[PDB]
Design a protein around this ligand. Structure first.
Ligand code: DGT
Ligand code: DGT
Ligand code: MG
Ligand code: MG
Ligand code: MG
Ligand code: MG
Ligand code: MG
Ligand code: MG
Lengths: 431, 431
């Protein structure tokens, strides 16, 4: 039921907010814009670590583009939905801008829990507990708590950052429940690991300490259970599909364009792989009148994004009933007519950009930096009577369980930028 | 007349676009988001040069906050305007979201022409032509062209960046005429210098090479002339007042908060100067329950921004007829009840932040960097037969008049970030 999916509740509320008596979905955008975690995204790795103030993307600019594309997708889907179910507007009072606001707010914050150095950073944080110092804690934690530690993802960290309670400020940013539902793409815990081939089962979305919180949200939105066991799991919110589609479109096209502009990909491929996407709307005279690679690739990027957005809207509207029922098992991008072109673009990006020498060098350095910082924090946690551990506490982190302390350490390491992490690493070693 | 101020025309159009047959004001936001000049704002100075990846603001985050505040102001003012003039909605078909879109798009791009190192950078570029090498060109240029060169501001550079014609792409970003009108705050040329004490006469808004372009815009929007001479000048677009109010509110409050968080201002002042702004809505229990300086200053900042936004809307609605007629001479912030508090905050910021030792060091370095780069470009321009000048052209800038070439050099220097400028300066000197 769509009347329960578009909820306006906030954490710690007793009177039900109504749409007629209102806007809730724009304050979420404003609150995310003005927060420190969002501001820390300006110097976090998207693909190339330590961007050197070049023209390449960071996490912040990527999130902004995903937000624009998500607003467009949400507006179109909301128009079609309001056409399909008239009573959503004539009784409850929902307009087609609310869907755009929800998807834009969710897409702006979709990537906020990521640590420095990107995917390699998450792998390093996991390997620290798996085959490093943190291994010593394995006997002192529940299997669900250990699987949280050794398979750390930014998806759970983002939910925690968004919904963190502190003395005097309950609920953290206190976003609406619809935004939280559209933000979550893996509504399950860390065990069991990969129970099936469903798209919503690749990873997990919340930690144990936050688990209870999500239950509340999942009760309010009327999500559909899938547990059939002692481990909880729910079905996806329908707008989470749109969030994922926007994320995928943006990074797939922009990575290719950035690689072309950097000199790692020849310009010819730009027309070898993209023409079928842009052939139906390209103006040949305008394309031929341009005189630099940047203009041509920008033109192609704009046309491709438009085409993919339209196709995604059509695909979503086709399989709406299955998504509402919970039986859909793929993403909207896998039901597309240009899957071969996307696959070729991704494979070329993997061969040329992800495995380039400079990228590998930066990832190797990031492994060492993260391991050193985590080991210092953990050793200061174990013994708190020495002078050195007091100094470490004063520099890095100015009544809890062991699991809560370890989660706090992981969270505090992941709020740093690449530059701050490198500077702290050099300071620890006195260089 | 408001029907002519909200124009949807784009550069190179022959058929008049109508509001009923439509959205135009959102494509402007999307186009600015995806452009390279907007992306270069992530590493440009707001107050503290070479931010060192800290929590302090850059140009990009400042522009985002100004955009949010501008959207709020525009929505409120548009609601009241549509209440005052019913025919704006029942015949033409304008909704209260269009004003918000126009003000948000104008506020997002309000600061895009700024050079590296902020105000000191503009002063250095001017001093280069005034008392440096570029002085040699004084005899070869018209007085209006020389006053453009020696009083370079980012306001004219931003208009040029927004409306730059290139082979195969006429009109640059091709934004709507309403957005261009709301973006311009000084609709006049560089001579005469400060003819009066009007707020719209402190600086100039367009260069000579772009002058003709603005005339077209000023013809379409029905702006009111003020020349009475051979030098053209027009009255302000009414929404430019809202853009300026949002810019002022944001930087005035956030500079204070950032100085407090950095350790340059004691926390006590935070309540000595802000209470009258926040005393009517502050919750004392919530304020006392917080346990860190960051939370308290963030709470105070939010409350102050809300109060100032409401007061600005009231002030604008009071003096609407004078603004439409063109007789208003001050900003909306000078007709406020909290002018003494704002003045005290600004004076404290000047004493403590602008004149701190680190800031002065960075500005002094930026002077040398900009002078070196400009001199190299100009010398390569003068003689183009030497091997060294060919190398300089190949490194820095891979049929025009002298004035056009000098303007192009100034523009190409101002597109660089602080890091890129420093790296190029070191490369020129071989360090
Ligand atoms: N350097 C590097 N970048 C990678 C690698 N794998 C992926 N990336 C980049 C490509 C994209 O810019 C970005 C994708 O991350 P996102 O968090 O946006 O989504 P992703 O689909 O990877 O995962 P998620 O939805 O979070 O489970 O990461 C890799 O092995 N190395
Ligand atoms: N470091 C430093 N920063 C300054 C100085 N004067 C102003 N600022 C900073 C304070 C604000 O963050 C920012 C204001 O620049 P904006 O371009 O936003 O507007 P402003 O009113 O200065 O001028 P405009 O409207 O462009 O004529 O510049 C100065 O002397 N030194
Ligand atoms: Mg992600
Ligand atoms: Mg993904
Ligand atoms: Mg992403
Ligand atoms: Mg400015
Ligand atoms: Mg100003
Ligand atoms: Mg500004």
């Amino acid at each position: 039921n769509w009347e329960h999916l578009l909820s306006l509740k906030r954490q710690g509320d007793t009177a039900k907010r109504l749409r007629i008596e209102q806007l809730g979905f724009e304050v979420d955008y404003d609150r995310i814009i003005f927060s420190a975690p969002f501001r820390s995204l300006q110097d976090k790795t998207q693909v190339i670590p330590l961007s050197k103030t070049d023209f390449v993307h960071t996490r912040l600019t990527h999130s902004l583009e995903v937000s624009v594309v998500g607003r467009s997708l949400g507006r179109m889907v909301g128009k079609k939905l309001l056409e399909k179910y008239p009573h959503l507007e004539q009784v409850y009072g929902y307009k087609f801008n609310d869907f755009g606001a929800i998807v834009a707010a969710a897409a702006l914050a979709h990537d906020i829990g990521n640590p420095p150095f990107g995917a390699s950073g998450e792998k390093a944080i996991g390997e620290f507990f798996k085959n490093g110092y943190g291994k010593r804690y394995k006997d002192s934690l529940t299997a669900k708590e250990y699987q949280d530690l050794i398979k750390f993802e930014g998806n759970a960290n983002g939910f925690k950052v968004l919904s963190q309670s502190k003395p005097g400020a309950q609920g953290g940013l206190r976003l609406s429940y619809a935004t939280l539902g559209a933000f979550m793409k893996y509504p399950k815990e860390s065990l069991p690991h990969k129970p099936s081939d469903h798209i919503a089962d690749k990873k997990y979305g919340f930690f144990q300490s936050e688990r209870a919180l999500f239950e509340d949200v999942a009760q309010e939105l009327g999500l559909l259970k899938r547990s059939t066991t002692d481990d909880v799991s729910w079905s996806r919110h329908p707008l989470a599909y749109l969030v994922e589609a926007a994320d995928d479109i943006c990074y797939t096209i922009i990575d290719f364009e950035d690689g072309i502009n950097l000199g790692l990909i020849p310009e010819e491929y730009a027309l070898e792989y993209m023409v079928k996407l842009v052939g139906q709307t390209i103006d040949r005279n305008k394309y031929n009148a341009l005189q630099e690679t940047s203009d041509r690739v920008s033109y192609l990027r704009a046309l491709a994004i438009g085409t993919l957005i339209n196709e995604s809207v059509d695909t979503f509207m086709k399989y709406e009933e299955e998504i509402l029922a919970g039986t859909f098992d793929q993403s909207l991008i896998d039901k597309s007519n240009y899957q071969a072109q996307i696959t070729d673009i991704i494979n070329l990006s993997i061969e040329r950009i992800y495995n380039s020498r400079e990228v590998i060098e930066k990832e190797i350095a990031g492994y060492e930096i993260l391991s050193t910082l985590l080991e210092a924090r953990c050793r200061a946690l174990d013994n708190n009577d020495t002078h050195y551990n007091q100094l470490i506490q004063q520099l890095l982190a100015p009544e809890k369980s062991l699991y809560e302390n370890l989660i706090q350490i992981c969270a505090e390491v992941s709020t740093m930028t690449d530059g701050k992490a490198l500077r702290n690493y050099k300071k620890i070693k006195g260089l």
